[PDB]
Amino acid sequence: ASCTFTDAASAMASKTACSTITLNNIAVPAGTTLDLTGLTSGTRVIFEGTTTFGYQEWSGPLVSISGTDITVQGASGSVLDGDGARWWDGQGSNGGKTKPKFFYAHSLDSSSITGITIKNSPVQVFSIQSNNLSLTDITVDDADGDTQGGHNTDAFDIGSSTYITITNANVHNQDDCIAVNSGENIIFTGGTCTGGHGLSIGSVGGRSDNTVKNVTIEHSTVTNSQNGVRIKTVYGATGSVSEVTYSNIQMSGIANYGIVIEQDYENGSPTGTPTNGVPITDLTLNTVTGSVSSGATEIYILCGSGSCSSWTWTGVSITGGSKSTKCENVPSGVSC
Ligand SMILES: *[C@@H]1O[C@H](CO)[C@@H](O)[C@H](O)[C@H]1NC(C)=O
Ligand SMILES: *[C@H]1O[C@H](CO)[C@@H](O)[C@H](O)[C@@H]1O
Numbered sequence: 001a002s003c004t005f006t007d008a009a010s011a012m013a014s015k016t017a018c019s020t021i022t023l024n025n026i027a028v029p030a031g032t033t034l035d036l037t038g039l040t041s042g043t044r045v046i047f048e049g050t051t052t053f054g055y056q057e058w059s060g061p062l063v064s065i066s067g068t069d070i071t072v073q074g075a076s077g078s079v080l081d082g083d084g085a086r087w088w089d090g091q092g093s094n095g096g097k098t099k100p101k102f103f104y105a106h107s108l109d110s111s112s113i114t115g116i117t118i119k120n121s122p123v124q125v126f127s128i129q130s131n132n133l134s135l136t137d138i139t140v141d142d143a144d145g146d147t148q149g150g151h152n153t154d155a156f157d158i159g160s161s162t163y164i165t166i167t168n169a170n171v172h173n174q175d176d177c178i179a180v181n182s183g184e185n186i187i188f189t190g191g192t193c194t195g196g197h198g199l200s201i202g203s204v205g206g207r208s209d210n211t212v213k214n215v216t217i218e219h220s221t222v223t224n225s226q227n228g229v230r231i232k233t234v235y236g237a238t239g240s241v242s243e244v245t246y247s248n249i250q251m252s253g254i255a256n257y258g259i260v261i262e263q264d265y266e267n268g269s270p271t272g273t274p275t276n277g278v279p280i281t282d283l284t285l286n287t288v289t290g291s292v293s294s295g296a297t298e299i300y301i302l303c304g305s306g307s308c309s310s311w312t313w314t315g316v317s318i319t320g321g322s323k324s325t326k327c328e329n330v331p332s333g334v335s336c
Pocket of ligand 2: 003013014
């Protein structure tokens, strides 16, 4: 049966009794999750109008959906509006107010999310911990955060996941466009990323799952961002990153690093000295091109001893800025 809800309490009470759930203009109570977990397999969820959220300092999530064979859709013109400026204080998840993560897709398996627009997330947007989940035509509009104190507004954080496909995302934020902390068989294609910290593998290490395998980030553009292409592995951690491909990536307006691969990463600041417990093997860059800003570095590779091997880099051409004086343990066939 089809059900339309204009309040969160009714939707939560009746979600398992509905095979199509329409969420129309819901104001989600402060400090609570719009909890659409535990759906019956096959259910379709449609967001309509503007979903809003009450103000409270808490960790979230604002929205959570789970189940098998779930189809999540944003209707034309729909928005999930976090009004994140109520929390933004320049400090994100590193300090200041406690700020709620936006959208949990944990165990949203053999499922899809299409056409969702998120506006002004308080902090990170999608937390993905699922198998066989596609996210298509997603828009993250956090542009207000450029001037109003947005920080740590990651669009897609992935861990403990398999068979994730992200297609035609459009992101304007202040942190990673994608951050693959762990996972296997992951595709990001057709994306436009602006404002943030780039298309990132990692940080990898220091968690329960520190394994990244078979990831393709392709046919995408990164503009007006701190980094273009980034792989970050945690200083002193243990894990592995293998079979990663960046292909057909264009970048411009990059402030810090066009391409940065570093094995000294920490959330506060990298140490400057890499370690070798998170090997990066079978990394392919194919046709990664564009420009960096005058004060940026084109390519920076800071690998540990023996922990970067079997790389294939072809068609890499990054102009502007300066060449790095700091690269370490650069593999055969690769250059800064
Ligand atoms: C790598 O991942 C892609 C997409 O998830 C998949 O189509 C492909 O079969 C995977 N390769 C292997 C060897 O599993
Ligand atoms: C959720 O919605 C159903 C109708 O779909 C109600 O019967 C229930 O009481 C709750 O309001």
